[PDB]
From Swiss-Prot, chains A, B:
This is Trifunctional enzyme subunit alpha, mitochondrial. The modification N6-acetyllysine is found at residues 23, 58, 93, 99, 107, 130, 138, 154, 157. GO terms for molecular function: 3-hydroxyacyl-CoA dehydrogenase activity; acetyl-CoA C-acetyltransferase activity; enoyl-CoA hydratase activity; long-chain fatty acyl-CoA hydrolase activity; long-chain-3-hydroxyacyl-CoA dehydrogenase activity; NAD+ binding. Changing residue 86 to D: In MTPD1; mild phenotype with slowly progressive myopathy and sensorimotor polyneuropathy. Heterotetramer of 2 alpha/HADHA and 2 beta/HADHB subunits; forms the mitochondrial trifunctional enzyme. Also purified as higher order heterooligomers including a 4 alpha/HADHA and 4 beta/HADHB heterooligomer which physiological significance remains unclear. The mitochondrial trifunctional enzyme interacts with MTLN. The modification N6-succinyllysine is found at residues 22-23, 39, 58, 107, 130, 138, 154. It comes from Homo sapiens (Human). Induction: Up-regulated by thyroid hormone (at protein level). It comes from the Eukaryota. The chain holds residues 192 to 382 of 763 of the full protein. Keywords: Acetylation, Disease variant, Fatty acid metabolism, Lipid metabolism, Lyase, Membrane, Methylation, Mitochondrion, Mitochondrion inner membrane, Multifunctional enzyme, NAD, Oxidoreductase, Phosphoprotein, Transferase, Transit peptide. Signal peptide: none annotated. The keyword Transferase applies. GO terms for biological process: cardiolipin acyl-chain remodeling; fatty acid beta-oxidation; response to insulin.
Length: 186, 186
């Protein structure tokens, strides 16, 4: 997909829905799900993709369709000299967004800094000397426990819900009331 | 001076007078010779440059003048990707001008092919593995004898010239007569 295209993807952390992934170019074909079926209305949609896959699949064996395919096409061959003048702009970007005391994310930049212009297949062993470093460090060692608690408190944790709510009553407008209405309405 | 600027110089063989060397940029300052002197009219011109040199020279020690300085400036930083797309154009240029059975001149191209993009100071020993090759070969071994004869027959070789000519008489116009007049007149 490209250095500048996914460089604001793989370390921004944030996910993308399937709609922009066509215009991005990771996945190419889309198929919308189904409603009612002879089987319950979601089990067919997981069994619908098998046949769209098999009707793509025989075409791949005898090559009726090709796995080939306007801003990235401007970039697509053009980096002989602007090399430092992109990841330097990113080098100070990561320390203007956050501060410099995250030793995590710049340590994936050195991958894509060395993956370009050097041995690509030889580049698949640099991160072997890197993944063991920044996992066995004091930056994100407790970050796994943060994630365990993150998933651990998105749980009901009190028995079973009895007599669920459907209406609310927010006594007082202002900044909290209209505020919590802004999230509790959709 | 540049790859495309002198690339049509160092293997075209041909010399340049001092007038175009300023616009080229090898030599920077010019000085025209002199006529009559208190000493004979050419010995002063070789003794004139000593003082123009010494009046440049004291300025170089205390830096009043600098050794710094529009088609080459377009090139001057711009070769990240057009690399093959210049010496390939030259690669078939040398075999369209001559034919391919000169193993001499392409063996200075590989110098300037490897001098760019690789170790420059390390590049000063490649031609040590090259100059010994194309001098000790059967291409130009007799070319030195051709040059000995070239200088050897630009000589009077018959005593001293007695009663030199000043007039000519060309009996018959056409292609030789007007032809040899074209060279014997200037």
């Amino acid at each position: 997909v490209g250095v500048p295209a996914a460089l604001d993807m793989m370390l921004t952390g944030r996910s993308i829905r399937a709609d922009r992934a066509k215009k991005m170019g990771l996945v190419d074909q889309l198929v919308e799900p189904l409603g009612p079926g002879l089987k319950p209305p979601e089990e067919r949609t997981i069994e619908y993709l098998e046949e769209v896959a098999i009707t793509f699949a025989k075409g791949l064996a005898d090559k009726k369709i090709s796995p080939k395919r306007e801003k990235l096409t401007a970039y697509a061959m053009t980096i002989p000299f602007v090399r430092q003048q992109v990841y330097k702009k990113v080098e100070e970007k990561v320390r203007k967004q956050t501060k410099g005391l995250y030793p995590a994310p710049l340590k994936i930049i050195d991958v894509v800094k060395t993956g370009i212009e050097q041995g690509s297949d030889a580049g698949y062993l640099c991160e072997s000397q890197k993944f063991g470093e920044l996992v066995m460090t004091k930056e994100s060692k407790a970050l796994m426990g943060l994630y365990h608690g993150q998933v651990l408190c998105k749980k009901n944790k009190f028995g079973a819900p009895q007599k669920d709510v459907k209406h609310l009553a927010i006594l007082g407008a202002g900044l909290m009331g209209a505020g919590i209405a802004q999230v509790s309405v959709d």
